[PDB]
């Protein structure tokens, strides 16, 4: 099916109508998404099938057709854009200055933007348009809203 680079919706016809379970990035013939979106299941692109290649529940990432290709990192200072692809709604770039998740194993950038869970897998970009991570794994704060980590994989 379609293998052109870009952002894609991940859909399912298992529930009522067509439901968006998440989003992903196609880059270099590899489809990148969050593990919780597909649970490692196979995907269809037109008449073609995309099989999982690599995945990790703790990183909450999965790649299809080949190894993880995205390796750009948030520089720790500049604003970034979340290319949000919400269910039933047009793709829109949202600019923000990331906060920080402080962990026992080091600091990670975090984006304080709240979108429905079917937006999980939307890419976060630097000013060169490089994907520095995916949106959709984070925490719920006092207010009930979401703060996502900027989750990036390793390029072998």
């Amino acid at each position: 099916g379609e293998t052109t680079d870009g952002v894609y919706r991940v859909m399912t016809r298992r529930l009522l109508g067509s439901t968006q379970v998440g989003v992903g990035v196609m880059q270099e013939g590899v489809f990148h998404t969050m593990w919780h979106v597909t649970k490692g299941a196979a995907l269809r692109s037109g008449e073609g099938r995309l099989d999982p290649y690599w995945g990790d529940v703790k990183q909450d990432l999965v790649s299809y057709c080949g190894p993880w290709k995205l390796d750009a990192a948030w520089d720790g200072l500049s604003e970034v854009q979340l290319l949000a692809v919400p269910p039933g709604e047009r793709a829109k770039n949202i600019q923000t200055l990331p906060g920080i998740f402080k962990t026992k194993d080091g600091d990670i950038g975090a984006v304080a933007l709240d979108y429905p869970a079917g937006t999980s897998g939307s890419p976060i970009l630097d000013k060169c348009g490089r994907v520095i991570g995916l949106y959709g794994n984070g925490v719920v704060i006092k207010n009930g809203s979401y703060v996502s980590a900027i989750t990036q994989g390793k390029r072998e």
Binding site: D5, A91, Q95
Partner: peptide, 13 residues
């Protein structure tokens, strides 16, 4: 069975 649909290009706006 899950399927994908293109939604856009990845570019800084």
């Amino acid at each position: 069975d899950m399927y994908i649909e293109r939604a856009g290009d990845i570019t800084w706006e």
